[PDB]
Amino acid sequence: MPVGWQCPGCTFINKPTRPGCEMCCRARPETYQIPASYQPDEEERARLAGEEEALRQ
């Protein structure tokens, strides 16, 4: 049932927008495309919003 990018190292399926594997730290495959239709959970949305906050400052 998970949705996202499979880490080819450990097979954990990661949130599309996470840059590295939540389990084993391996980097997201460069070929995976974040879907435009992905709707992140509140924690991940807030994380990204934080990053977006930093840029404007």
């Binding site: 049932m1 998970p2 499979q6 190292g9 450990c10 097979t11 954990f12 399926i13 840059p19 590295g20 594997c21 939540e22 389990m23 084993c24 730290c25 391996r26 980097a27 994380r47 990053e51 930093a54 400052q57």
Partner: protein, 151 residues
Amino acid sequence: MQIFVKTLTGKTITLEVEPSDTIENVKAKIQDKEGIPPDQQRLIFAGKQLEDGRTLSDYNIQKESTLHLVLRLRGGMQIFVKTLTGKTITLEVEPSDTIENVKAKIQDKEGIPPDQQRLIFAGKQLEDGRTLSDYNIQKESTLHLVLRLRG
């Protein structure tokens, strides 16, 4: 019935289990074989992190299934380090790690000596002898690495 647990380090562990065994029981069997404390074990199947109170049957894990094992520090967390080349590295750290400790981990990935690394967070260059905890750097925080290049 038999199930197999594949580690990152290549190795495959063979276990004897029943569909009714809990994830906890499985981790205990891995500890019996490999010495690994269950609190350091992350088991993965069908792309999911398995929860301790569930059973193999709960996850529809059948005879001769392969589970993947990743080891993680009991009190650890991850942070991201973004480089000016756009590479993002993901590191396992703990609140107690000093910036110097973090640099040592970056050197493993980037091959850059700590004395040539600067880390920026929240607009501020971080100081070597202070901890992530001191800076209120929490799980999934992004730090920015800048290289000090001679000349």
